[PDB]
Amino acid sequence: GQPGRFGDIQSRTLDSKDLYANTGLKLARPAAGNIHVPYTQTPSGFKT
Amino acid sequence: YEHTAVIPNQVGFPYKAHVAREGYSPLTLQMQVVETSLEPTLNLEYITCDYKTKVPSPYVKCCGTAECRTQDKPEYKCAVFTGVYPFMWGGAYCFCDSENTQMSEAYVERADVCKHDYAAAYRAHTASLRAKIKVTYGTVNQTVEAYVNGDHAVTLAGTKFIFGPVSTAWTPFDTKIVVYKGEVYNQDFPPYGAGQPGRFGDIQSRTLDSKDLYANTGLKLARPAAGNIHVPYTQTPSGFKTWQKDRDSPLNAKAPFGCTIQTNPVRAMNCAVGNIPVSMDIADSAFTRLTDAPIISELLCTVSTCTHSSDFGGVAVLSYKVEKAGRCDVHSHSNVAVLQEVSIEAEGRSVIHFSTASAAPSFIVSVCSSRATCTAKCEPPKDHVVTYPANHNGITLPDLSSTAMTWAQHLAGGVGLLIALAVLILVIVTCITLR
Amino acid sequence: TCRVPLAPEALVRSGKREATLSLHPIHPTLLSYRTLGREPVFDEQWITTQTEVTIPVPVEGVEYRWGNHKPQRLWSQLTTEGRAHGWPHEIIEYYYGLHPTT
């Protein structure tokens, strides 16, 4: 499942322990003089 | 020793040339441009900015009529109205009921934000351009900025570079431009004092201090209401702030050759057209005479791999018998394939990279003063889109002896042949019919 | 100074002689594209919902700009479809993918 369209998170029978997820996480540089965690992501595929 | 050459004006591209003096070992220079500005000449003609009106406090005096006076200010209009009977807050104002008269005036001036916000006009002329060139050879990396009109020399360690004037000096501008805050447009603005109301150029001024205006927005004065105190007022709305929402597409999106703009002084950068000539006055302490010049003979070149493609995708080896270690220099003497490295190493076998946009190349290469040839056959790559350009001249022409047109001489010679038995078997009876 | 939202990433896909796009906007954005020849084509238009649009791309180069990003240049590479040696039925059409006028 390429990111964005349907079938972006898979699983077989719905209990647990196995996933598949490729949404393109990358980590960015924090600001000059603050404390936060930056974060970048193509938005979700189910609720689009 | 002096020399001349030409180099292509395109950012990030290798080019190289020689001297071959006499006696001494050869020497190979490479020239590479990193930046190219461009700059026209300007002279201001007027500006424009937003305006604001003033209506200073109308005048009543009752049972006594009027007269207003004229005065010097742009677009002053006074009026006079008879039979007015106001009715102010506390009660009725004054009681000389029939014979009352009232005057009104107003004018137009520039706003308070003109000295941060304006939009000026200009005019263009002939332009000059300047470049920054990285030149390397011998044992030295150097870069140098230079004017391009043919008068400005510059000094490296003993040497003189002066550059040829231009190929041609056209520009991506025409004679009238208008500049507003970081992008330039291309209009045709009204001359002076003829701005009809509503469109651009409704308020003019020369150099932006004060004392002179031009303003024709059609002020008219109207009759006040029945029993109030105000000043009526009618006007076609302003011309500046009806331009900066319904505008155009700017010139940073229809520029011809990738020619990008940014302007506190107006420029046009990395603009990629044409050739620039170069000439050379070379010093003498940057050669090698013969003492550390190695002698190399029986050179033989082969090939193993090629693509077209867009980078250094052709490899070749070299074979030669040595007598002394050192460092020689390499070059390919034709325009169909450019090499990569500027100096091979000494003893043994050594490889060279090259690129060529053709099906079957053949050229002659010479690590030092002995010469050799080596040719190859090639095949296309499996891709369609690259991210980095143009590491070859761009000439895809056939050779004089390929698989492709070895087919050509057989057909043309074959069709050349069968007329040849036809031509003489005509003639051999053409004599005997004059018996 | 002042801060700006920075709309998300646009991922690119290739095809022979033309590159296509795919977009995923949160809230409205802008496109544009030049062509680096002598006469451009310079079409540009606002988008609101997720679609796809195609560009052309010649052998000289084009470049786009999506949102508040510094631009990305994009050329095209010399590719054919046939071989380069063999029977002469094949060699003539090998050039036809390259200079199809002459």
Side-chain angles (χ1 to χ4, degrees), chain B residues 14-345:
Chain B
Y15 185 81
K16 50 180 64 61
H18 298 90
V19 289
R21 180 78 178 276
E22 50 89 15
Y24 296 155
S25 65
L27 189 273
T28 61
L29 299 154
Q30 78 170 358
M31 306 290 288
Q32 184 175 0
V33 296
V34 295
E35 192 66 35
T36 299
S37 176
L38 198 146
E39 175 181 355
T41 59
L42 298 177
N43 46 1
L44 191 147
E45 196 172 3
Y46 62 95
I47 67 167
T48 182
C49 68
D50 195 358
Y51 67 94
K52 184 178 176 67
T53 185
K54 286 178 71 177
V55 281
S57 296
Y59 182 74
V60 288
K61 73 179 183 69
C62 54
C63 46
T65 306
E67 184 62 32
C68 67
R69 292 185 294 272
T70 61
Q71 59 187 357
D72 190 5
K73 196 172 285 186
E75 198 73 25
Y76 185 83
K77 289 186 182 295
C78 174
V80 48
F81 293 148
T82 184
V84 62
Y85 179 74
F87 187 75
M88 203 178 74
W89 169 67
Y93 186 73
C94 59
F95 294 168
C96 301
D97 293 330
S98 176
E99 195 267 328
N100 292 327
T101 312
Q102 190 268 332
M103 61 172 280
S104 295
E105 78 273 14
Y107 57 85
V108 51
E109 67 182 3
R110 60 182 66 187
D112 295 330
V113 296
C114 289
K115 69 103 169 177
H116 300 93
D117 189 3
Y118 56 91
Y122 283 102
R123 185 184 293 272
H125 289 290
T126 311
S128 67
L129 64 97
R130 63 104 175 269
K132 290 197 282 185
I133 294 175
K134 187 178 173 71
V135 46
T136 188
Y137 69 103
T139 55
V140 52
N141 281 324
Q142 281 296 106
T143 182
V144 50
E145 69 275 14
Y147 282 158
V148 185
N149 49 357
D151 61 350
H152 179 70
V154 68
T155 63
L156 289 172
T159 63
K160 301 289 186 183
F161 292 173
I162 62 104
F163 293 97
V166 75
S167 177
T168 180
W170 66 274
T171 185
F173 296 103
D174 46 354
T175 61
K176 291 178 183 179
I177 65 171
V178 49
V179 174
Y180 165 66
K181 195 182 283 185
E183 69 269 22
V184 64
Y185 289 150
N186 193 356
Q187 292 291 108
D188 193 359
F189 58 93
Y192 195 86
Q196 301 300 321
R199 294 174 292 178
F200 175 65
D202 189 74
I203 299 298
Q204 288 84 12
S205 172
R206 286 180 177 88
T207 181
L208 71 157
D209 54 359
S210 182
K211 270 76 179 173
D212 285 324
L213 271 300
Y214 181 80
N216 44 4
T217 63
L219 271 299
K220 298 291 177 69
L221 281 306
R223 183 178 176 87
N228 281 316
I229 203 65
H230 66 88
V231 170
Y233 175 68
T234 177
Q235 186 181 2
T236 72
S238 175
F240 185 75
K241 63 181 291 184
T242 188
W243 176 70
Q244 65 181 1
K245 69 179 72 175
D246 182 76
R247 188 188 296 177
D248 205 77
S249 297
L251 191 273
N252 290 117
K254 62 175 75 175
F257 288 99
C259 210
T260 62
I261 314 297
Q262 55 262 14
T263 170
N264 31 0
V266 53
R267 290 176 289 177
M269 294 165 66
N270 286 106
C271 211
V273 166
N275 307 118
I276 53 170
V278 61
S279 67
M280 298 292 293
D281 183 77
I282 299 172
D284 200 78
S285 69
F287 285 171
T288 60
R289 296 183 65 92
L290 280 180
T291 63
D292 285 331
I295 305 301
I296 290 95
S297 298
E298 58 267 14
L299 190 65
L300 186 61
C301 176
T302 62
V303 72
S304 68
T305 309
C306 73
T307 52
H308 288 87
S309 67
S310 290
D311 54 355
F312 291 145
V315 290
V317 306
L318 292 176
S319 63
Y320 61 94
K321 293 287 176 66
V322 79
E323 48 88 23
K324 188 63 67 177
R327 189 173 176 87
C328 181
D329 300 330
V330 293
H331 178 78
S332 69
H333 293 285
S334 294
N335 209 169
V336 75
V338 294
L339 298 173
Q340 186 265 333
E341 56 190 2
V342 73
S343 294
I344 202 170
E345 193 67 23

Side-chain angles (χ1 to χ4, degrees), chain B residues 249 252-260 308-310 377-378 380-381 383-389 396 398 403-404 407, chain C residues 14-17 19 34-38 40 42 44 65 73-80 82 84-85 88 91 94-95:
Chain B
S249 297
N252 290 117
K254 62 175 75 175
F257 288 99
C259 210
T260 62
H308 288 87
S309 67
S310 290
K377 65 177 72 70
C378 214
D383 205 81
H384 302 279
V385 167
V386 77
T387 319
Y388 60 98
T396 292
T403 69
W407 208 258
Chain C
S14 176
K16 189 175 80 71
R17 202 59 58 192
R34 283 184 287 174
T35 301
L36 303 181
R38 191 168 61 246
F42 59 91
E44 58 90 17
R65 179 162 58 194
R73 294 182 183 271
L74 202 282
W75 286 267
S76 67
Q77 195 172 5
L78 187 57
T79 184
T80 339
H85 299 292
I91 307 300
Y94 165 71
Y95 283 175

